[PDB]
Amino acid sequence: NMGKLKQEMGGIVTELIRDYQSSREDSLQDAWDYVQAQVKCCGWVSFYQWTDNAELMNRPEVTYPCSCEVKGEEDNSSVRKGFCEAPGQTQSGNHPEDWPVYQEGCMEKVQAWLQENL
Amino acid sequence: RSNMGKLKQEMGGIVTELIRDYQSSREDSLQDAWDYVQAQVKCCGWVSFYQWTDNAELMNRPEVTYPCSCEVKGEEDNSLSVRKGFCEAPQRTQSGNHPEDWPVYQEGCMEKVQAWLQENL
């Protein structure tokens, strides 16, 4: 019964990544941005699942979710939403291999994070 | 309802079944994730803590027993103190499990998680 719930959980997150709109303020989008920023991960299985987001991949520049971006930990903090344009990166289309984002998916890192601190 | 609302309801459906199938002895990452939410956001159940009464194992206990992650507790210094499993209320009368006796957070996680997200982003 738990294997069914885990797969349904992964299915919701996958469609959430597909339907993510950078301009809309939504609590479900906020919760996912929080997980990616705090657990330090991108996507569910991998960050390439964000390539199924039509709005993201239609950008002319290297654009990625801001919550996925590799960043240091602040003092007493911390989650940026929406889409971020890569620093320095010609208008040659969106390139996922160029995203300065965490390379591990949140599926694997959340379980490791849970088995480590609780 | 919008496409995000229907993902929100499906997410709430998983949590409801997760609470029903919750086993105090099993080590599971999905159970761990829910215990973390209840302890950190300080809430119990999805809509309300009465959803835990759908857990047959919990309601079959002879004493006042509640999820440990729901328990009212102070915040530790630099520590994510999250207790798993079922907790028995602080020798007592063996008159069955009474949810009205649970020293747990009275707010459901559905309402409280959005408030936590809408405040500190």
Among residues B100, B89, B11, B45, the alpha carbon closest in space to that of A12 is found at B11
Q: What CA–CA distance (Å, rounded) separates A94 from B80?
A: 38
Give every CB contact of residue B52 below 8 A, 6+ residues apart in sequence.
B19, B44, B45, B58, B66, B67, B70, B99
Block residue for tokens 């159940």: B45
What is the resolution in angstroms?
2.4
Closest Cα in chain A, distance from residue B53 (Å):
19
Strand (E) positions, chain A? 63-65, 83-85
Q: What CA–CA distance (Å, rounded) separates B54 from B66?
A: 12
At position B115, the amino acid (one-letter code) is A
Q: Beta-carbon neighbour count of residue B104 at 10 Å?
A: 23
Residues of chain A with C-beta less than 8 angstroms from the C-beta of B121: 30, 79, 81
Indicate yes or no: CB of A79 within 8 angstroms of CB of B121.
yes
CATH of residue B27: 1.10.1450.10
Structure tokens at B116: 């936590």
Indicate yes or no: CB of B30 within 8 angstroms of CB of A19.
no
**3-state SS string for chain B:** CCHHHHHHHHHHHHHHHHHHHCCCCCCCHHHHHHHHHHHHCCCCCCCCHHHHHHCHHHHCCCCCEEEHHHECCCCCCCCCCCCCCEEECCCCCCCCCCHHHCCECCCCHHHHHHHHHHHHC
Q: What CA–CA distance (Å, rounded) separates A30 from A79?
A: 9
B83 within domain boundaries:
no
B96 within domain boundaries:
yes
A81 touches chain B (CB under 8 A): yes
Block residue for tokens 């973390």: B36
Among residues B32, B49, B53, B50, the alpha carbon closest in space to that of B96 is found at B53
Indicate yes or no: CB of B4 within 8 angstroms of CB of A12.
no
Residues of chain B with C-beta less than 8 angstroms from the C-beta of A110: 29, 33
Overall domain count for chain A: 1
Contact B53, B59 (CB under 8 A): yes
B102 within domain boundaries:
yes
| Main-chain phi, psi angles of B86, to 5 degrees | -110, 145
Nearest Cβ partner for A110 among B8, B21, B33: B33
A88 in helix, strand or coil?
Answer: coil
Question: What is the enclosing helix (H) or strand (E) of A73?
Answer: none
Give every CB contact of residue B76 below 8 A, 6+ residues apart in sequence.
none
Among residues B94, B82, B117, the alpha carbon closest in space to that of A33 is found at B117
| C-alpha separations of A117 from A104, B56, B57 in Å | 18, 29, 27
B19 within domain boundaries:
yes
Residues of chain B with C-beta less than 8 angstroms from the C-beta of A44: none
Q: CB contacts < 8 Å between A and B, how many?
A: 66
Nearest Cβ partner for A5 among B3, B18, B113: B18
| Main-chain phi, psi angles of B84, to 5 degrees | -100, 175
- In DSSP terms, A101 is beta-bridged to A69
Indicate yes or no: CB of A29 within 8 angstroms of CB of B82.
no
B114 within domain boundaries:
yes
Could you tell me the residue range of the domain that residue A28 belongs to? 2-117
**Which residue of A lies nearest to B111 if distances are taken between CA atoms?**
A27
